[PDB]
Amino acid sequence: PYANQPTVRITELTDENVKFIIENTDLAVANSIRRVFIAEVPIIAIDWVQIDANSSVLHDEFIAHRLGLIPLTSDDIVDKLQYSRDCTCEEFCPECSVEFTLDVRCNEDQTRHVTSRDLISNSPRVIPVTSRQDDILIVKLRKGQELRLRAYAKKGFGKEHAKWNPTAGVAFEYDPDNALRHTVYPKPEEWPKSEYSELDEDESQAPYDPNGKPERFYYNVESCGSLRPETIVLSALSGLKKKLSDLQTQLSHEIQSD
Amino acid sequence: KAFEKKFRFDYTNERALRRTLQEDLVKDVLSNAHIQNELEREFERMREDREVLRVIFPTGDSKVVLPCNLLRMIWNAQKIFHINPRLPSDLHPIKVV
Amino acid sequence: NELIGQTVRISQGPYKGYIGVVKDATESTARVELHSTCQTISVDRQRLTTV
Amino acid sequence: AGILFEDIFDVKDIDPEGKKFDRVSRLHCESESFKMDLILDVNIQIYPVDLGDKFRLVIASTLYEDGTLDDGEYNPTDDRPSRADQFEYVMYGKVYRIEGDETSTEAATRLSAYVSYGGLLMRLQGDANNLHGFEVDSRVYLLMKKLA
Amino acid sequence: MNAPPAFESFLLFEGEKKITINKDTKVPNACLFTINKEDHTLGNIIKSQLLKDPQVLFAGYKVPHPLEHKIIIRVQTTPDYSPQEAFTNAITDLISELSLLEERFRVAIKDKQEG
Amino acid sequence: MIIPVRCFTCGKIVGNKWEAYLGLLQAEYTEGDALDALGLKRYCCRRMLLAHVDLIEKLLNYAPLE
Amino acid sequence: SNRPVMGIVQDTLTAVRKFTKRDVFLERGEVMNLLMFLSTWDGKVPQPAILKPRPLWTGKQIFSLIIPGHINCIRTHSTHPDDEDSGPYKHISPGDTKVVVENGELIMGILCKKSLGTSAGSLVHISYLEMGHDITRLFYSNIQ
Ligand SMILES: [Zn+2]
Ligand SMILES: [Zn+2]
DSSP states (O other), rough: OOOOOOEEEEEEEETEEEEEEEESSSSHHHHHHHHHHHHHEEEEEEEEEEHHHHHHHHOOHHHOOOOOSSOBBBTTTSSOOOOOOOOSSSOTTTTTTEEEEEEEEEOSSSSSEEEEGEEESSSSSOOOGGGGGOOOEEEOOOOTEEEEEEEEEEEOOOTOGGGGGGGGEEEEEOTTSSSSOOOOOOOGGOOOTTTTTEEEEOSSSSOOOOOOOOOEEEEEEOOOSSOOOHHHHHHHHHHHHHHHHHHHHHHHHHHHOO | OOOHHHHHHHOOOOOHHHHHHHHHHHHHHHHHHHHHHHHHHHHHHHHEEEEEEEEHHHTTTOOOSSOOOOHHHHHHHHHTTTTOOTTTTOOOOOHHH | SSSOOOOOEEETTTTOOOOEEEEOOOOOOOEEEEEEOOOEEEGGGGGEOOO | OOOEEEEEEEEEEEEETOOOOEEEEEEEESSSSSSEEEEEETTTSSSSSOOOOOOEEEEESSSBOOOOOOOBBOOOOOOOOGGGGGEEEEEEEEEEEEEOOOOSSSSSEEEEEEEEETEEEEEEEEGGOTTTOOOOOEEEEEEEEEEE | OOOOOGGGGGOOTTTTOOOOEEEOOOSTEEEEEEEOOOOOHHHHHHHHHHHHHEEEEEEEEEEEEESEEEEEEEEEEOOSSOOHHHHHHHHHHHHHHHHHHHHHHHHHHHHHHHO | OOOOOTTTTOOBBOTSSSHHHHHHHHOOOOOOHHHHHHTTHHHHHHHHHHHHTTTHHTTSSOOOOO | OOOOEEEEOOOHHHHHHHHSTOOOOOOOHHHHHHTTTTTOOOOOBBBOSEEESSOBBEEHHHHHHOOOOEEEEEOOOOTTTTTSSSSSSSSSSSSOOOEEEEEEEEEEEOOOOHHHSSSTTTTHHHHHHHHHHHHHHOOOOOOH
């Protein structure tokens, strides 16, 4: 029983931002939570594109790449969605993927902006984030140019591809006054103070703490739009707990095997 | 003078020898004239070698390229066998020669 | 072989959903040249369905 | 009980020729009981030492009052009562040199012991009568405590 | 051409084992846990939580190659305590700490949303 | 050729901001004021709109083969 | 040229100069992490150079664990003063510039290209000539 007893203080919560503070935990725990923010939080993003027609100036793999990076609202759906690899379906089904379609032809003499508003899903929950600011521009079409495609968006996390990363910016820091001397400033007076610095203006560093350890960690998790910023953190804690649970199950099997 | 002081064995100074060597080695270094004769022959051989070195290296450059690093392996022998340099040694000079 | 040259879809395993063309096929495994990447994978034919 | 040296030192100088390292400072200290000269590299960050400070310095072959020699291995779970409990700054090192004013004529009257605590060097020099416990390539412990 | 698939960093293939324990004979009460398809994310927390245990004499982790996906955790404990028990206790404490953190995060989020 | 959907460094959406950036620059905004008005605060995102060359406008001058 | 063809280079050289400075202290977790990458480690953590107030190991202890066998070597750092060898502090270096490896242990001194490089009489050269090619290969890999 050597577990930490960490506390949470939410200092800011908007639709694209959670600034919170985790106290009384370890630096490894804080960094693993920060890494799971980027790499191990599953969202829904386009991963299968067939293109029936592409008369645009951008080639087909270009359009597929731009479709994969469009975020889709994965709230309360990616939890009840299976992985395609773990699904028993032959090709695709609502249990593991969301179907998107696009059919835009430009018949007018001005440029047609094929945006993420033109992405039509059969699931009313999983839609492009800008369709729920302008829309994410996929391609521009001249007159006589057409883009007709069918896509499937599956579930995955940022460890596989960056299009499944739910976060824009995970600001993470600790010990804002350099009390632990984890970084050593050659000229401490040359360095600007952070947002969380508790020093007056004449000071440049805290006095050195010989017995101190990293015990308070400041996060600013910014969401790209797929999940709410608090949903990213909750799913990250759940995913890290699930990874440790599966590792403990395999460890119990390995121990009882010997 | 420096070569004579550094490289010639001094079997005459007995009280300086009692701390350099153990007592039973000092007894047959002082008494046995054969040991003293062979040590003097060793010093004469080294003086002849010194003159040969003077002929070979006339610019006085002592940096040579030789197979076995003798000083390093003497240091290795000191460290392996825990040689205390503050104590008299149990190695007789005739054993060295 | 009757599978070589036929377009094919991986239906099981970690390549599920990928479309390819069978360059070389045996009774057990088939070399599927993938349309989506720059590689030719080797996958067993029980994970393959013909489009 | 394994003690090789025991004295009270007072600091005459801190980094005389300038500070060469940020966290390590070189103290020059003198003594009262045996008239000793001490040069000691101290981790000045975790153990700050001011000029003119007085401290008890103990150099021991082991950290136990039993006198039993240790293995030089880290043992945080050791529960026997250590000698380090009575001191603030405890280092572990290997004495690497014994120098002296000995000649082929006269024995050593002054002795200098050079110890390396993981690269933090110490020279303890003085009368030879108090430096008999130092033998080259033996592991010693330095234990200093500040005196109010 | 020689690009590894993106799932190879986290998916065990057929016949691959998630965790393997090998007792190294260099020192007593030491074990090496080879965990496949894992990275620094689990290695760091397991190493730190083992370092919080006073009965653990050594706790370390390493990735032998960043191009491979394999974690080696070397755990040496006191003779009255096994490295496998230390590993199980570390994972149990990590899971309990993360569950407490998740519940307190939900409580604080509800406090921030309500007012 | 066309504005990236994601910022390369962090992954913020910058693909819905190019036309708004051009409209703000047409409204006699300075480029820094335009980037501040679009919520691009990190300098990794600001270089995505600042350094972008819209070559797709030049590609759309040529008539389509179809 | 009866000298090694390969020595420690670039990042490993810069960080072994930064590592073997006198004021480099590693905490317990950092020491265990560094010992995870020492393939010739016998499995016992050495006694730290400082036990109290906090148990801290120096980088010289870790490199002494890296140094194979019982290598004996004397080098000088590239910033070693010329007048120091004739001064009173020749065997206790104020600037930690005389490198002494004794019984395979880095007693004192900051390592650099003059000690870990391709020059004759260096630590890797003496490691080769005393231990053999296999032990020296392990030495190179462990340093890196
Ligand atoms: Zn399915
Ligand atoms: Zn950015």
